[PDB]
Amino acid sequence: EVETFAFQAEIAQLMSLIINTFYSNKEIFLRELISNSSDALDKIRYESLTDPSKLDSGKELHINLIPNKQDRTLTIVDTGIGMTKADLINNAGTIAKSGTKAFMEALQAGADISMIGQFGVGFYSAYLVAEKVTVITKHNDDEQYAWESSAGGSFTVRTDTGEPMGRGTKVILHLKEDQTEYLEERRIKEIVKKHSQFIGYPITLFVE
Amino acid sequence: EVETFAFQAEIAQLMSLIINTFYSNKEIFLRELISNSSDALDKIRYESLTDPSKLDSGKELHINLIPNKQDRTLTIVDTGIGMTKADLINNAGTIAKSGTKAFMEALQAGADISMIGQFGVGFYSAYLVAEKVTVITKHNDDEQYAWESSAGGSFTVRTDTGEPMGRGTKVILHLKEDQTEYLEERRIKEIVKKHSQFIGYPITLFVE
Ligand SMILES: CCCCN(C)C(=O)c1cc(-c2n[nH]c(=O)n2-c2ccccc2F)c(O)cc1O
Ligand SMILES: CCCCN(C)C(=O)c1cc(-c2n[nH]c(=O)n2-c2ccccc2F)c(O)cc1O
């Protein structure tokens, strides 16, 4: 039921850098995850133009931010196109390899960690604030999958037995003990207003 | 052979704004066209992972910048995924409508024309420097098409009888008389270094 995969050398090295480098501007993880969600929403919106049945799994195109102080998690939910099992493995493999190489070269040349998104590896900035990331995803052409990594050079993929989401992606950030500010309403509002004010989909910040 | 289409009200209004508003920072058109080319290159690179035959129409993934002082044109060529006839009409229609609305609202609120790309309508910044834009495109699933507009509320689409390009998109900017600086080698190099230094594909500036 649970499949374990080794990250390739470059991605494993990038994840180690993100976890271990001293960098105070951690708030940029939110902008990267929202940007990825917006891109997935653009994809399903575009496909629905030639094929309206693509929206049978859900018409609403939105992003939800769900803080949970009890579980110490910040969840980013979108109703985008979602990812197939192959998409998950390819995005944690071949895509993340070319992106990492180009980004790590720039960091050595004097670039900032905040430019990560320009290299297509923005998702991995989640490890600035999270000790573990769980991704639940559902694409129209596949079953619901759960991807997870606490870094450490590996990730797991399993079919998800949880509540069906219709279509889209849910990124569950298991926050580091010293990073609970990202569970606070005013702090999340501040980051969204600063970095994601022009996203073309409604962003709802859930209250506890 | 030649089909004529009316732009919808919002896009026609955006194109008029771009042509008539006083805005000195025109150089941003290049960044938007290179960004679109990079996105199309990401698309074909991703599709080729599950299907390597997608690269039968060309393996090289690059961007070429071709100035022509005689014809007063700056051409941006890419070997990206290209666009089908439907893609051309949809990108000049439904996609450009939602993007325009969101962008024009921001401009009224105090935003800058330089943020156009965040709204998915970055291509239309070409009209800051061009009096006419011709687009030649070839997608694996369709024939070679020529799209053209001098704004004025309409665009044409025809099957292209020119030289086959294999796969990708060619954007031909017919420059305004006072915008010939964008044909100069040092000026193009300056803009690419400033705004497109981290693009993940080789950018070749052709010499005359
Ligand atoms: C195992 C590594 C993957 C990490 N995750 C979850 C992400 O990057 C990520 C992906 C999507 C997504 N759904 N469908 C789709 O095409 N994308 C996508 C979007 C932008 C770049 C690439 C993408 F695949 C999302 O909505 C939200 C995300 O945070
Ligand atoms: C009639 C209006 C269209 C204007 N043009 C030519 C562009 O926007 C434009 C489009 C592509 C392209 N090829 N394939 C594909 O998917 N794209 C694409 C990329 C980014 C956003 C949307 C896209 F369709 C390109 O390589 C270069 C471009 O300058």
CATH number, domain with residue B143: 3.30.565.10
What is the total count of domains within chain B? 1
Window 147-186 of B, Cβ < 8 Å to A:
none
- How far apart CA A78 and CA A93 sit, in angstroms, is 23
Starting from the CA of residue B92, give the closest ligand: 2
Say which residues have a Cβ less than 8 Å from residue B184's Cβ, sequence separation at least 6: B67
Mutation pick from A43, A46, A100 vs chain B, by most beta carbons of B within 10 Å, is: A46
- How far apart CA B208 and CA B205 sit, in angstroms, is 10
Run of H or E residues at B42: helix B28-50
Residue B52 burial (10 A CB sphere; 0-12, 13-18, 19+): exposed
B196's tokens: 């497109």
Distances (CA, A) of A24 to A30, A176, B116: 14, 14, 30
Which conformational region is residue A144 in: left (phi greater than 0), alpha (psi within -120 to 50 degrees), or beta? Answer: beta
What lines the ligand 2 site, CB under 6 Å? B 33, 36-37, 39-40, 43, 78, 80-83, 87-88, 91-92, 123, 135, 147, 169, 171
Mutation pick from A197, A198, A203 vs chain B, by most beta carbons of B within 10 Å, is: A198
Residue B36, annotated as binding a ligand = yes
- The answer to whether B205 and B63 are in contact (CB under 8 A) is no
**B45: nearest CA partner in chain A:** A95
- How far apart CA B17 and CA B2 sit, in angstroms, is 27
A135 C-alpha to center of ligand 1: Å?
A: 9
Q: In terms of residue numbers, what domain contains A206?
A: 1-208
What is the 8-class DSSP label of residue A102? Answer: H
- The answer to whether B126 and B29 are in contact (CB under 8 A) is yes
Q: Which is nearest to A81 in space by CA: A190, A1, A168?
A: A168
Atom of ligand 2 nearest to the CA of B83: 14
A53's tokens: 């049945």
**A-B contacts at Cβ under 8 angstroms:** 36
Q: Is B9 in CB contact (< 8 Å) with chain A?
A: no
Which residues in A53-81 are b (16+ Cβ under 10 Å) and which e? ebbebbeebbbbbbbeeeebbbbbbbbbb
Q: Which is nearest to A92 in space by CA: A42, A167, A157?
A: A157
Q: What are phi and psi of A89, to 5 degrees?
A: -65, -45
**What one-letter code names the amino acid at A72?**
R
Closest Cα in chain B, distance from residue A86 (Å): 9
Lookup result for tokens 């996105």:
B39
Resolution in A: 1.8
